[PDB]
Recover the amino acids of this structure.
């Protein structure tokens, strides 16, 4: 965490056209950009949302260049808002996922990315989660695809508490910067 977070959204592919430079949470792009077809993340990790005020689908954006919306696995070229992800300092990521609600049933523990929950612990769904340290992104499908959910340090007694309407979770990634 040396430089401050910075992200630029562009209206056209390959970082062309009208752009919006952003260095803090922005709840509404639409006075600035009609569409988003490419993005450059210079510092920090960000989450962008399909619609203003942080609603609709979420997409994690890490450092680097996204020359078209497929690079962040957008459904299309519509983004409305974005937030900078705040990474706590100290112990690296530590997460527990539970086969049933309220931290019940079988538990699976990780300190690294998991590309397939089913492969590693044979859970088909996730119904609760404890993020002991760090901050993580849940993915609906194995291998870091499908709907995304952001889980800061805390306790999630059932999937609605990380914003999901189904218990579909099959991979996850820690956000270390």
């Amino acid at each position: 965490s040396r430089a401050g977070p910075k992200v630029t959204f562009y209206e056209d592919k390959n970082f062309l056209g009208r752009r919006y430079e952003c260095d803090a949470d922005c709840p509404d792009f639409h006075t600035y950009l009609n569409r988003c077809n490419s993005i450059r993340v210079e510092g920090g990790t960000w989450v962008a949302y399909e619609r203003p005020n942080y609603s609709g689908n979420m997409y994690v954006l890490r450092r680097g260049e996204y020359p078209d919306y497929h690079h962040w696995m957008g459904l299309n070229d519509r983004l409305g808002s974005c937030k900078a992800v705040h990474i706590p300092s100290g112990a690296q990521g530590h997460i527990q996922v539970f086969e049933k609600g309220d931290f019940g049933g079988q538990m699976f523990e990780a300190t690294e990315d998991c590309p397939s929950i089913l492969e590693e612990c044979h859970f088909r769904e996730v119904h609760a989660c404890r993020v002991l340290e760090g901050i993580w992104v849940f993915y609906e499908h194995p291998n870091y695809r499908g709907r995304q959910y952001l889980l800061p340090k805390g306790e999630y007694r059932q999937p609605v508490e990380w914003g999901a309407v189904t218990p579909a979770v099959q991979s996850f990634r820690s956000i270390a910067e």
Remarks:
- Residues 103 and 114 are 19 Å apart (CA to CA).
